[PDB]
Symmetry: D2
Subunit: 336 residues, 4 copies
């Protein structure tokens, strides 16, 4: 019988590290193994302990006996580029968080099964793995699914809000912009990005338009919205915290105060901890290290009429998403 | 400067300096006087000569015999706090650019007529002065209008694009976001902004939502769109160049390729130099010092369907607007 | 038994002195004056902080007072500091943190409304200046108006003390690479007395003058005339670093310098002077309450007499906590 | 005349841009194997820091055409077989960031012609700094280095100060704009942990051999200078902060006179001089190696001074690589 699932992390990056932080903070899962061939054990101690965005780790972290020891818990450290060679089973890792960014198809992520992992959670959208958003469709998970995706940061922001708006008023169609903090895939100054020329341009100097499937992906976790949403992104030079800007047409008329009422109600009830709601005069830094997937900004949005509205929701793209990865794994464990 | 209208500039803040720069760069009007009671002549030289965003003035600027001398042309310097006392007429200034931002009503901007100026152009939105956007409604200007407004940079970006879309396909309704470079009204660190609390939060650290009437104001220069457009802004920590994000529903169906064709057509014909068009992989810095009001980014926009699109347009909020102020004065001069 | 304190100016330092007071409990804030921040706005500016995060505690407006952690605070809205009724509010000490009343004559305006002592949260042309850990025991009850110097002097002087005590400083030249502050501008703007300081702070490295190094010769008299320096403002929102190049009287290997700084940080300068060998960057000191943290790995010695020493400071949080510390120690001497 | 460029990064493109902008030399080849010819046009045409290229750039049946000049590209992974000879590449600029040693950089006459210039400090190639030791290059040396941007800023200033007052000792700090080796967010930099931390968020201390390297191009200063750097989140333009003890007493005004004199005479266009109230962006696209900021410096006394000099770490160096090839 499954109790508290043991977890391996592939890719000790922003998400790999903050998933580990979130697992130790929430206690919902146990981290027992980490693989990253570009960060050795002594370096992992440093990268985990000090964090420019979220501050120093509250807890203890050290290297001892070849293990990474976090709050007294030893963690097996692997250094493999090929995920099919990681001995997850030997280390007792049952679920693997696939957070490298480079193994996002079921075929590539399934490599972890060869080393004895039982299931894999891709920390990003997948071309073919079933995608889940906590609070929207995670109850559709079942234990026949050994390889799944937790979607994107942006889909985890848009989808809980889209669900409340659609449930209550009906979304005829919607177009989304996300203004998004810089990330590790960008460049400090103009450099090579042969697939995506705009993404090579210097991230500190530029507003950079970018494509994203996050809005269309909401139609996969909310099938009634299939084909009804799409969108794009602007990358801007802030270190963390991003925002969704949803322009949608509604089937039923909705005064903005009615939109506020149902979003606040959902934030206090069935979407508590997932969807937040504020009326305060907030800015992006007010959501740094905020664990919600989506926080509706009542004062920032604007209605043209009862059927055509612009809705604003904030997300700490690092911290909210990392906590959802842990939440999703604990839910999967409960369904074994 | 043969046959060019002679201009006085009230205020040598960033708009007044950039209008002055545009006048001498284009040759279209003759700056003959500048008023500013809070900036002495030696400081004017420094502020005009060095510019962090657009670089050193391409020309000569020096103080000589109590006048500011740009490219060899001497400019009379006034230091009057009471605009009704500036002796524009004695200096030969026929049109006055009212750029201080604190005399934007007709009652206050009209003070320049007392000192002998003949017309006043307010380089900002006005509560009561008729507003104009070059390329959109500037032919509605007539010689009875002694005090007018050139609207805002953002209105000057949206309105040319909205004109083309509405003219060809009909805009049923539209909602606009502008992702806006930082401005002088913002704060370096969290500070007081008693009327607009979010605007007081540190500009370098934050994405900051802000209200704007720029989209609604398009209903003034395009009367058929009255009540059909509104929007909001996100201020982000970039030094210059902003972007308009227009989500609109169209009356007639329009393939994205058809939108591109008619925008490109306008950019090469009657809106040449006002509305630009590109398909290149551009980012914000590529429009630094670009004098268009509005440059449509073909690749960055996205359509959900034939009646519902998101259109993207760049503007150097500083250089485009300042050149339009000069262009507007040149048009006024052509009527007398 | 804690001294009751009034704060004039509810800015970065006014608010963070208030935060430090309630967090440490060392003094009791009972009054705040700021004619540009009304009570409801005070709740917001104190609650939310882009740099140091949301306040850990409660803050609300109730019965016309600002209530922090259940403690009501009288709110004044006076432009003229001589008109603030500190005595009626029970404020015994006043933190003068507006930046515009830094002489003894101007800061003494608070005595007219009943304050007993004033602590200027800035350098003063004439008020005696104190740096915790360096010369604060030289304070005495006859001093009604004093200065806690600058953030930079509070970083440099504890380090300069250790180096001078142990090896002697013949002469030194200091650069501080300093985070942006409220006096700077977001884009090129008017600053008619200091032209460089009007240039846009997000885009530029900006050279600036500072009396901070010269002022160390006032809190450490043996160093009078032996230090000066300057600043570069750079576009980070908080945390700054001192870069002291000095000639030593007696020779010291760099490991000797590390030993005596580490010892000082663990003993007499604990909580004031920190010491690290970690691979730190400025973000690692955000909300760090030290006045000065020596970065052993970052400095470099040319020889046993000529060294460059690096020390970090959270210019907001270290200094604000020192203001509270200084008042606590003043109160213990009443 | 006639030059090829290995690599098309910030230094490769700006050398290429400085070549056509100055006309001192003719670019006739480019390599960089990780960017196709179409991408080359875009990267050279648009530049976030320095603006769009003042000219024309297209592709015409192969060949990158800049202002009407074909260039020919090779896209080869290792330098040993690039075929610079049949292209006309009389010189080659390294620019790749690797191949800074004389053995690894040597693989350029194996299929090429004549001389090779390394756009970085070299472990063992002879280094040169225009205006300081460039009049001591000779035709025997076919694998040379142009030092670094920072050495090119410090050395001209150090030469003038040393020639006139003698530098007993000096310690240097560079406050340096962000570079391509830094990271947008906290990421891996296994040999240099501080450099992995988020470049937008942080002042980052860093080691640099630039001040020690000055003792190599100015031998009388060997062992008399060292220093360090702080990386800060600005996009371009850096500044040198030199604190030094002088043998001969010097009023600051006398320091100003000899630096201004040098800037107008033998070091013109290499060492600049200003008393204006400048900030870093005032030097974007400035082609000087080093511009002395008179008002920013400070003296404690006649023998102990802090001297401040600005440099566009991209543009000044790139034009020195071109000026060095001009002097051969
Ligand atoms: N940063 C965010 O806001 C965010 C939010 C949600 C999802 N994601 C997604 O999560 C994934 C990780 O993003 P991130 O921001 O943490 O990136 P990151 O670059 O910070 O982390 C990636 C890590 O993977 C490591 N790695 C690279 N190759 C590897 C291999 N072969 N085996 C093991 N480890 C390897 C790298 O060393 C790095 O530490 C991406 O798919 C991203 O799209 C990111
Ligand atoms: N920010 C730092 O790092 C730091 C560190 C140490 C010392 N200091 C010094 O502390 C002082 C305050 O600096 P700050 O950064 O908090 O500046 P700030 O601008 O953030 O705070 C100043 C506050 O004073 C208020 N104020 C202005 N005039 C007033 C008046 N007549 N009466 C009452 N209040 C008034 C303003 O509303 C503002 O809120 C300055 O002298 C500064 O040099 C600053
Ligand atoms: C969250 C992020 O890592 C960063 C932003 C990115 C878009 C919105 C620019 C997100 C969307 C993804 C996608 O649409 O495929 C990738 O996965 C993510 O989580 C990213
Ligand atoms: C701490 C600060 O408010 C900000 C930086 C400033 C200098 C270093 C640029 C400090 C120095 C002062 C001085 O000693 O002259 C002024 O007061 C300060 O506290 C400031
Ligand atoms: Zn913390
Ligand atoms: Zn929350
Ligand atoms: Zn244009
Ligand atoms: Zn006429
Ligand atoms: Zn500390």
């Amino acid at each position: 019988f499954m109790g508290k699932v043991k977890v391996g992390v592939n890719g000790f990056g922003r998400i790999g590290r903050l998933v580990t932080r979130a697992a130790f903070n929430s206690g919902k899962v146990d981290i027992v193994a980490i693989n990253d061939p570009f960060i050795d054990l002594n370096y992992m101690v440093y990268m985990f302990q000090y964090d420019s965005t979220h501050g120093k780790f509250h807890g203890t972290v050290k290297a001892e006996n070849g293990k990474l020891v976090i709050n007294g818990n030893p963690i097996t450290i692997f250094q493999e580029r090929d995920p099919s060679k990681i001995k997850w089973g030997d280390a007792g890792a049952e679920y693997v968080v696939e957070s490298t960014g480079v193994f996002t198809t079921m075929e590539k992520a399934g490599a972890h099964l060869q080393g004895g992992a039982k299931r894999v959670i891709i920390s990003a959208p997948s071309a073919d793995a079933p995608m889940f958003v906590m609070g929207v469709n995670h109850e559709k998970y079942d234990n026949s699914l050994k390889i799944i995706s937790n979607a994107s940061c942006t889909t985890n922001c848009l989808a809980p809000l889209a669900k409340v708006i659609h449930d209550n008023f009906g979304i005829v169609e919607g177009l989304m912009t996300t203004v998004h903090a810089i990330t590790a895939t960008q460049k400090t100054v103009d450099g090579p990005s042969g697939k995506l020329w705009r993404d090579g341009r210097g991230a500190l100097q530029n507003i950079i338009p970018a494509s994203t499937g996050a809005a269309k992906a909401v139609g996969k976790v909310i099938p009634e919205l299939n084909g009804k949403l799409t969108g794009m992104a602007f990358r801007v030079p802030t270190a963390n915290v991003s925002v969704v800007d949803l322009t949608c047409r509604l089937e039923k008329p909705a005064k903005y105060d009615d939109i506020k009422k149902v979003v606040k109600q959902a934030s206090e009830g069935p979407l508590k901890g997932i969807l937040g709601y504020t009326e305060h005069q907030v800015v992006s830094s007010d959501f740094n290290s905020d664990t919600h997937s989506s926080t509706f900004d009542a004062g920032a949005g604007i209605a043209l009429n009862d059927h055509f509205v612009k809705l604003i929701s904030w997300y700490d793209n690092e911290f909210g998403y990392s906590n959802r990865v842990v939440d999703l794994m604990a839910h999967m464990a409960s369904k074994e």
